Amino acid sequence: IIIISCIGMFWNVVENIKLYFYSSPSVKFEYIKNDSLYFPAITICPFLLNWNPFFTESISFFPEMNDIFEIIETNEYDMLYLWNKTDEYFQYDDSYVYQDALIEEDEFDRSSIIPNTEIMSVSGKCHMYSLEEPVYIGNAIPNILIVYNHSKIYKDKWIKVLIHSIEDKLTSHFFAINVGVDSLLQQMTEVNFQVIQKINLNLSNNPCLFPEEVDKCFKKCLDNFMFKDLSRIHKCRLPFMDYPPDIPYCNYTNFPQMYTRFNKILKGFNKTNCLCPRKCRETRYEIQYQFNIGGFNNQTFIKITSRNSITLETEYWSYNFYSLLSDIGGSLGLFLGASILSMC
Amino acid sequence: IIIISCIGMFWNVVENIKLYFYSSPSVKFEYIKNDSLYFPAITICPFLLNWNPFFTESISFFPEMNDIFEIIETNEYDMLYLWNKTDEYFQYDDSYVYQDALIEEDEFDRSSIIPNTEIMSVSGKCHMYSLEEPVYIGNAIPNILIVYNHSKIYKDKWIKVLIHSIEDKLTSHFFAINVGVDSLLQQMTEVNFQVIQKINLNLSNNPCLFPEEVDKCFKKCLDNFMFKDLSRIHKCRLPFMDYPPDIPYCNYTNFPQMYTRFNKILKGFNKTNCLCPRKCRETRYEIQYQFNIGGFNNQTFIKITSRNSITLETEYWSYNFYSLLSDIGGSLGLFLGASILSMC
Amino acid sequence: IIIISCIGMFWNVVENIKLYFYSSPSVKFEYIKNDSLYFPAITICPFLLNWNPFFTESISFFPEMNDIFEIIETNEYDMLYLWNKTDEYFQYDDSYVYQDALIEEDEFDRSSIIPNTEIMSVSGKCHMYSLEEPVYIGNAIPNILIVYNHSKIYKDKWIKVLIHSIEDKLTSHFFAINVGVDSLLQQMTEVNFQVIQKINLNLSNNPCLFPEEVDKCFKKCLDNFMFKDLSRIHKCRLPFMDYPPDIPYCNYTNFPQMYTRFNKILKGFNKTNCLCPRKCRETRYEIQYQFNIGGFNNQTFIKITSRNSITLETEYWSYNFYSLLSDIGGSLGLFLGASILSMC
């Protein structure tokens, strides 16, 4: 009985030390109403290069991608001139954060944003709008309004509004075509998003990093993963990649093949292969819903809002050291009635 | 060893008693499918007093707020007559709870609601629709349909549909302008909401109260906080405040200044300053999404629904007294092998 | 003191054994981003039999249900011919899973779905679209596009898009009228859904079963519950029930009464009465939101997507046996300083 109880004592002490150290961190889920919220960055990108009004409008038919490649081969474009000419069809006119009050704000309360306007992305030149300090959410979530002007009354012309975190401004626009929201030109749209905060625990085996460093790691991995295949193909870089700095930009002769490859490459690109550390404090913004207000307009109004609360996922340890010791003592006091003093 | 083990025993017993008493209550998160759900109250409010068709229609230009103030100064309106005249442009015709069945319900199954119609809010006179007993959600969530009639074929005229809890019917319409959903006149709209229940634990330091008392506390605090600034300005009360009962209603001369102040006052009003107790059983209704059905109509149809499940956040204590005693006993049996009997 | 401490020891040991065995399983809530997701089945069903263009179009007025019953009595329809003729007004033309890439997919990358097209449901003949293996969600959620062709330019004609799990393909279409989403004919629609996975624990008292068996149990219970009332009424089966296999299908004389009864029967049908076991691994798909793209079209495009992450609810036991033993030992070591050895 002393021998069986001692094999038991030792085993119940193993199980405890297991559940303390070798156990996954538990997760606390909350639906919080934060009085101040960090608004997302909004990247406005041009739609597929087969639909850019710089190509579509001139020619007669509705271009396809191969027709666009032939056009780029005929008129011999610098691929950087071609990237510059794409953004011309929204022509940002005004963007401001404003509140929905009982006396409509008029150019004095609304805070004016200045987009980046020089982002290079898979579809052309994109504009990023962002805020530097959080807005007050106590009464309601303020509205961002991006206004775009056009020259002609465009029909069936689209852009992409991608809502992301400013801490992911280096590797977010590339997926705007698939993760973005289609916005019709000359038509007011409302994109109500939802915020998902996740506080991860820094672990020795899996140490989380600041969002800046995780974004840099993802950007570097994306650049190497693009350049490997694009050097396999023709050994040049497209206008939307900055990594091989010496390696020259592609020309019109090589751009079609590279773009056709890169589309397929990006279709299956998976972030799991890019082994980068997690984020200790990560904020994501999902699209809660999209609404269309009114009919045709002479300006494209893009309204970004949230009608929802923040979803908080905090990682915490349910087992403390002071409970591990108590459980080991309980095992000792059940199986053998032992103690520190006793053993000693 | 006896002295170091005793300083240890005592410290492991402190940590335990800490984690039991001096610890935050843990939260259980569920996505429940309640067979019966309390439908929210729906407050239909007029849009900004610069857009009310009682002002906009008569004059030539599109009024601004200062033009409205000048008009209120010219035609000398009783501010209570002016609040009465605002609601005239939706003219409730019918509202009923109906189910989406395979044989459409026709005036015999649908339950008829009678709105309040006499709410006073920052924008004018508002109508509250509510249900007295829960509907059955077993098969699907029934639909509330509010029908509004108008005189002229109004163009670019809007109202505000605010979805709230009946237990918050005293301090909810005031924020309808910012927390509401814009509904276009003479156009069917669908406002699908989501329900967030949160069961808080009554704590000695932070004792929760019934939703009625929390709503009364918030109403009282809002009334005092409005009246302080509005007595600073001109020492009168607007048509949408009931608190200083003797204090006379404002007239046309003083209404412009008071309203202009009150807009700014409400822009930054924060409920944290209003220290009121939490709610033991609080139910919130967020807007899941908004859809537009059809084009122009001779009646404004507002459809309120839910296509989602309820989000339950229950506060509970993960540590019980019978586990505190066990952990203290384990600490005693590890560090010193002590016990009640022993010590005694 | 020995007697009071022993009544205490025994009681603290009861409380522990209670909280271990006789306690509800705890729930872990996560917002996961699964690299591969099982897309839902999409059931396209005709709208109410009073609005089917097979009836509405021929006659002059807008039929009501009683007018449809009179028509079914006049022209003497086989109720199976009548169920066949209803589906003719969407005429599936193409359905495929495609990704939103920077070079639009054209009939080579998109995977072609073949709907079931022979489902019998309360409203007529329905088409189920489904996928056999999960799609990759690493970069974005691919889009399902269902294309429908029509003969005439239909006005105010609707269908129902119900998003459900393939493991619930036997008892899901029946509620499509109430749980479905109204889609307007000849008009592109986007139905963005959200996924709710729930991993239940198999319990002796409440043993969960595979989704196939739970779906079969629900189908059987629905069939018996329909047939009981429908044999009370006229002792025949409607075209959308397969259970009493010998019992003949209803004819035009009896169909009106049976359908009128069955509508009311289905209005209050509750699954709680149908005592079937839970699902160990259940996946639900709720409608996140619905968007309308463009205006009139010659084809009905139904786009099914998700812009969101999966909501995971995993049931797990917070108390392990190796912690129960430790707590019992701690209770023994606190109240009496006992142990296995001691007692023995």
Author numbering:
A (entry chain B), B (entry chain C), C (entry chain A): 46 to 389
Which lines from the publication concern this structure?
In this study, we identified a proton-dissociation-permeated sodium channel (PDPNaC1) in the antennal sensory neurons of the centipede Scolopendra subspinipes mutilans. PDPNaC1, which is permeable to monovalent cations, assembles as a homotrimer. Unlike most proton-gated channels, where proton binding induces currents, PDPNaC1’s transient ion-permeable state is triggered by proton dissociation. Thus, the identification of PDPNaC1 suggests the remarkable diversity of proton responses and molecular mechanisms in DEG/ENaC family.
At pH 8.0, approximately 121,831 selected particles yielded an EM reconstruction at an overall resolution of 3.03 Å. The architecture of PDPNaC1 is composed of three homologous subunits, each featuring two transmembrane (TM) helices. The extracellular domain of each PDPNaC1 subunit, containing 12 β-strands and 6 α-helices, forms the palm, thumb, finger, and β-ball regions, which are common features among DEG/ENaC family members. Notably, despite sharing these conserved structural features, PDPNaC1 lacks the extracellular knuckle domain, which mediates proton-induced activation and desensitization rearrangements in cASIC1a. To identify the potential proton-sensor, we calculated the protein charge distribution of PDPNaC1 (at pH 8.0) and identified a negatively charged cavity near the extracellular domain apex, formed by residues D227, D145, and Y143 in the β-ball and palm domains. The pore radius profile corresponds to the non-conductive state observed in PDPNaC1 at pH 8.0. Along the ion pathway, we observed two constriction sites corresponding to residues Asp372 and Gly375 with pore radii of 0.86 Å and 0.39 Å, respectively. These distances are insufficient to accommodate a sodium ion (radius 1.02 Å), thereby constituting two gates (upper and lower) within the central pathway, analogous to those observed at Asp433 and Gly436 in the cASIC1a channel. Above the Gly-Ala-Ser motif, we identified a narrow constriction site where Gly378 from each subunit converges to form a hydrophobic seal, with a pore radius of 1.28 Å. Notably, substitution at position 378 (mutants Gly378Ser and Gly378Gln) significantly altered ion selectivity, reducing the permeability ratios of monovalent cations to Na+, especially for Cs+, indicating that the mutants enhance selectivity for Na+. These results suggest that Gly378 contributes to maintaining a permissive pore constriction, thereby enabling broader ion permeability in the wild-type channel.
